[PDB]
Amino acid sequence: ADLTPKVQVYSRFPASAGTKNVLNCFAAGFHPPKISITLMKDGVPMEGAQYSDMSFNDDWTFQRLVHADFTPSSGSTYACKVEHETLKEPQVYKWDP
Amino acid sequence: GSHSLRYFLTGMTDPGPGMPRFVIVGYVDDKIFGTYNSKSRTAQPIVEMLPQEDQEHWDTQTQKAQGGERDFDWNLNRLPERYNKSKGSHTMQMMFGCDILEDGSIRGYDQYAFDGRDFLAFDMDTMTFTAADPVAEITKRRWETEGTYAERWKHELGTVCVQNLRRYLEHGKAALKRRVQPEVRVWGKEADGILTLSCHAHGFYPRPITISWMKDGMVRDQETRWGGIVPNSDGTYHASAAIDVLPEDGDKYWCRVEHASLPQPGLFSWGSLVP
Ligand SMILES: CCCCCCCCCCCCCC(=O)NCC(=O)O
Ligand SMILES: [Cl-]
């Protein structure tokens, strides 16, 4: 019953090297609504990322989707960095493609 | 059939740098149909679902959302003093809408929360209220004695919401009736003599889906972990299920996926290819 973000990282399509895709970072179940969500490639924030309008689920906890069009490259590491006042330090969620 | 219209309103004293302090997201049947925010100050349709909307309807939505924004701004300034918890950031939320059930009957919803906790709710079937704490109780008692709120929201939920739902179902039918079949990937990762199998369904619509793990024809629901249904940005959805198994049994487990787009369930296994 903690208000920390529960985070999932996934692509719109099952990934294949060189094929256009969308990378998603979905955070949910958190409170307060202020939250930092950054999609990263090799530790560099990804260009073109967009964030959904703030919304919430039935128990009033908040959720937010961050997504970026991208072409996955082999050898790179994609991840989502999340910061929230319920967390003592940032948490990093790797994409397992 | 059965259909739902829902509005999710949020006001924040501390939204984050550059973020709007007030936001509304509207849903028809698990599909976002329009939004409002205090930066743009405009209610706008999602044009991929509603591509031919008249201006007057959305000016009316904008006028109502602007009134909501002002009310949320007042509450965020005033409720903290009434709770004697002035410091810190604060939030106000409301969810309301309507269902048209399979038999044609109507159901209304109207609930509020402050700082993420139940505040008050309104029952449009009986035109009564309930409140979760003494601050909300004072508001509730004033509203019910005056009688204006209940008449307004019975009409809002039971007439306007229903009419708008029927409108959006008709105007957005092309997007709503569409079925997108999921693409499924099965993956296995072994560690410490345990093989974790995972099954991910990518990009399906509509939202309802089931994922199960099966062995010897028998479902293994007690051993399965589900990640939950989560959205893609194009209006489709994603879902997952995982199970821990002995490495020597990896190729005996099958992930079963049921979805409206699949006349019979899909069945996928680790170590096999699907041409
Ligand atoms: C999809 C975006 C367009 C949405 C249009 C609908 C907006 C409805 C806003 C209701 C505002 C309700 C405040 C309230 O209940 N205040 C209580 C009070 O102060 O008396
Ligand atoms: Cl939602």
Q: By what technique were these coordinates determined? A: X-ray
Quote the CA–CA distance of A35 and B15 in Å, as a whole number. 8
Domain segments of chain A as ranges:
1-97
In B38-127 the beta strands, taken as DSSP E runs, fall at 44-45, 91-100, 106-114, 117-123
Q: Which CATH superfamily is domain B183-269 in?
A: Immunoglobulins (2.60.40.10)
What topology does CATH give the domain A1-97?
Immunoglobulin-like (2.60.40)
31-60 in chain A: CB under 8 A from chain B: 31-36, 50, 52-56, 60
Quote the CA–CA distance of B268 and B271 in Å, as a whole number. 9
Q: Does A84 touch chain B (CB under 8 A)?
A: no
Q: What are the phi and psi torsion angles at B118 (to 5°)?
A: -45, 140
> What one-character DSSP code corresponds to residue A54?
P
Domain segments of chain B as ranges:
3-176, 183-269
Say yes or no: domain B3-176 is CATH 3.30.70.260.
no
Q: Which residues of A touch B37 (CB under 8 A)?
A: 53
Quote the CA–CA distance of B193 and B173 in Å, as a whole number. 51
Report whether B182 contacts B204 (CB < 8 A).
yes
Quote the CA–CA distance of B3 and B262 in Å, as a whole number. 22
Resolution of the experimental structure, in angstroms: 2.0
Per-residue burial over A42-70, b if 16 or more Cβ lie within 10 Å, else e, is: eeeebeebeebbbbbeeebbbbbbbbbeb
Paired sense of beta strands B3-12 and B22-28, if any: antiparallel
Report whether B165 contacts B98 (CB < 8 A).
yes
In chain A the beta strands, taken as DSSP E runs, fall at 6-11, 21-30, 36-41, 44-45, 50-51, 55-56, 62-70, 78-83, 91-94
Structure-block tokens of residue A45: 């924030």
Paired sense of beta strands B117-123 and B128-131, if any: antiparallel
Structure-block tokens of residue A44: 């560099």
Structure-block tokens of residue B211: 């994922």
| Ligand 1 pocket at CB < 6 A | B 7, 24, 26, 34-36, 43, 61, 64-65, 67-68, 71
Ligand 1, atom 18, lies closest to the CA of B71
B7: amino acid identity, one letter: Y
Q: Longest C-alpha distance within chain A, in Å?
A: 41
Report whether B103 contacts B10 (CB < 8 A).
no
Residue by residue, DSSP assigns B10-49 as EEES---TT--SEEEEEEETTEEEEEEETTT---EE-TTT
Residue by residue, DSSP assigns B209-270 as EEEEEEETTEE-GGGEEE---EE-TTS-EEEEEEEEE-GGGGGGEEEEEEETT-SS-EEEET
